[PDB]
C-alpha cells in the first residue's frame, strides 16, 4: 500500500495558520519521487536529507502539516527564523529533518470582495515552543489596568483576517503550504521508500 499523500496535497480546503492541521503517515510505502519531480510546486526545500535519498530511507513515523499564508510569508517557515508567523502561529525546531513545500492557490482561496475566512494570530503574551498550537480568542491586555474581555486601546482582539482578493500582487496572493517531518527511534520503521 502507498502512503495517502492525495489526502494531504489534493484536499479541497486548508487550515488557518494560527490553528494549523497535522496528519500522521504510518504503515505504508512513501513514493517521494511523485513529489520532487512535480511541476505543481512554487517552492520545495529539504533540511538534513536530500530528496533523492527519501526513496531509500525508512522512518518510525512521518507527519504532514497543512495551512494557508501570504506569498511573502513563506520565508518565515524555516529553522532559526523570526516574525509574526514564526513566533506566534507555527514554530519549527532547530533539529528539523524534513521538507517545506508551497504553491500559489489564488484561484482556489481568493474571492471577489476578499476571502476573510483565513486568519492568523497577531497577538500573544509569549512566544511558541516548537510544534505548539492554540485556539483561545481572549483579549490581549497591555494597558495600565486589566481589559476584562472588552476591546479598546492596548485591549486588542488577538486574531486578524487576510482578506484575499483575486487581483492583488503575487506577494499578497494566497499560498498553500505543506511541511513534511520525518521521525526515527529505536522503535521499528513504519514508513519506507519503494524498492
Amino acid at each position: 500500500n502507498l502512503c495517502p499523500f492525495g489526502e494531504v496535497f489534493n484536499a479541497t480546503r486548508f487550515a488557518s495558520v494560527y490553528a494549523w492541521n497535522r496528519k500522521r503517515i504510518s504503515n505504508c510505502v512513501a513514493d517521494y519521487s511523485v513529489l520532487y519531480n512535480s511541476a505543481s510546486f512554487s517552492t520545495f526545500k529539504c533540511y538534513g536529507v536530500s530528496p533523492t535519498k527519501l526513496n531509500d530511507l525508512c522512518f518510525t513515523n512521518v507527519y504532514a502539516d497543512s495551512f494557508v499564508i501570504r506569498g511573502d510569508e513563506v520565508r518565515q517557515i524555516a529553522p532559526g527564523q523570526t516574525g509574526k508567523i514564526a513566533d506566534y502561529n507555527y514554530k519549527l525546531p532547530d533539529d528539523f529533518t524534513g521538507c517545506v513545500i508551497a504553491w500559489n492557490s489564488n484561484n482556489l482561496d481568493s474571492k471577489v470582495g476578499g476571502n476573510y475566512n483565513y486568519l492568523y494570530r497577531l497577538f500573544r503574551k509569549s512566544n511558541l515552543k516548537p510544534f505548539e498550537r492554540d485556539i483561545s480568542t481572549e483579549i490581549y491586555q497591555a494597558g495600565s489596568t486589566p481589559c476584562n474581555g472588552v476591546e479598546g486601546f492596548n485591549c486588542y482582539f488577538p486574531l486578524q483576517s487576510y482578506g484575499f482578493q483575486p487581483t492583488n500582487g503575487v506577494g499578497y496572493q494566497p499560498y498553500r503550504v505543506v511541511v513534511l517531518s520525518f521521525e526515527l527511534l529505536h522503535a521499528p520503521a513504519t514508513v519506507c521508500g519503494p524498492d
Partner: antibody, heavy 128, light 111 residues
C-alpha cells in the same frame, strides 16, 4: 550566536594580510560564513562564502585569485588571506552569517540564503 | 551595474520618508528578492527587512517594504532623529554569481 573578529593591520604594498573570525553560542558546521568589505566612505562589497561541512568557497570575480577563504571544525573559526596588497585594499573587513542551516534543493544541491542576520565587529586593514 | 539607489533623503519629525532601489534584467528583473540594512557611524550594518517585506523580531513597526516591476522600496514612518543612518539594499545576481548591494542613502531629519 555572536561573532568575534581579529584586530587591525598595517602593511606595505606587495605584502599579504590574514583576517580571522570565531562563532560562539551555537553550531558552526552547517551554516554559511560570508566575507564582506567596506572602503572608507563607500558601499558594501561581497568577497566570498564558505559552508564548513563542504569546505570549498564561492568567490566574487574581482577578488578571486588575490583572496582565499578557509575554516576549522575543531575551533569554530573561519579565516581569510588577501595577497599582493595595494593602497585601495585599505578597508574594514567583516565576517557575517545566515540565520538558517544550508538546505537541499529538488536536485539535491546544497544551498544558502543571502540575508546577513549576524555580523562580526570588523577588522580595519591599512596599506601604506 | 549594481542596484541604483539615491545618495540621501529627508523629512520632518512624525512624517513618512520613502527610499527606492532599482535593478536590471538580471537580479530584481529575474524575480529574486530584495533585503534592506541600516548602518550607524563607526558601526557594522544591521538587517531591517528580508524577503521583500518580512521584518525581523525587534525591528520597530514603522519600517515597511515591497518589490514591484524592476524595483523595491523602503518606507520609514513616524520619523524620529534616531532614524538618521545610511540605508543599503541587497539582491542576488545570477550574472555575478553572488550578492550585489546598492550605493547607500543617508537619511536626515529636517529639524
Amino acid at each position: 550566536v555572536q561573532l568575534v573578529q581579529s584586530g587591525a593591520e598595517v602593511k606595505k604594498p606587495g605584502s599579504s594580510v590574514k583576517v580571522s573570525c570565531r562563532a560562539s553560542g551555537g553550531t558552526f558546521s552547517s551554516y554559511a560564513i560570508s566575507w564582506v568589505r567596506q572602503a572608507p566612505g563607500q558601499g558594501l562589497e561581497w568577497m566570498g562564502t564558505i559552508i564548513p561541512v563542504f569546505g570549498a568557497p564561492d568567490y566574487a570575480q574581482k577578488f578571486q585569485g588575490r583572496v582565499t577563504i578557509t575554516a576549522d571544525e575543531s575551533t569554530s573559526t573561519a579565516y581569510m588571506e588577501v595577497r599582493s596588497l595595494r593602497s585601495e585594499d585599505t578597508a574594514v573587513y567583516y565576517c557575517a552569517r545566515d540565520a538558517s542551516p544550508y538546505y537541499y534543493d529538488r536536485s539535491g544541491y546544497p544551498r544558502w540564503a543571502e540575508d546577513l542576520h549576524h555580523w562580526g565587529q570588523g577588522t580595519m586593514v591599512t596599506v601604506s | 551595474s549594481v542596484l541604483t539607489q539615491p545618495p540621501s533623503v529627508s523629512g520632518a519629525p512624525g512624517q513618512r520618508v520613502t527610499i527606492s532601489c532599482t535593478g536590471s534584467s538580471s537580479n530584481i528583473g529575474a524575480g529574486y528578492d530584495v533585503h534592506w540594512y541600516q548602518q550607524l557611524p563607526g558601526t557594522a550594518p544591521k538587517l531591517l527587512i528580508y524577503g521583500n517585506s518580512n521584518r525581523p523580531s525587534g525591528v520597530p513597526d514603522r519600517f515597511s517594504g515591497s518589490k514591484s516591476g524592476t524595483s523595491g522600496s523602503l518606507a520609514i514612518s513616524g520619523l524620529q532623529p534616531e532614524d538618521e543612518a545610511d540605508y543599503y539594499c541587497q539582491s542576488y545576481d545570477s550574472s555575478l554569481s553572488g550578492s550585489i548591494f546598492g550605493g547607500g542613502t543617508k537619511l536626515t531629519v529636517l529639524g
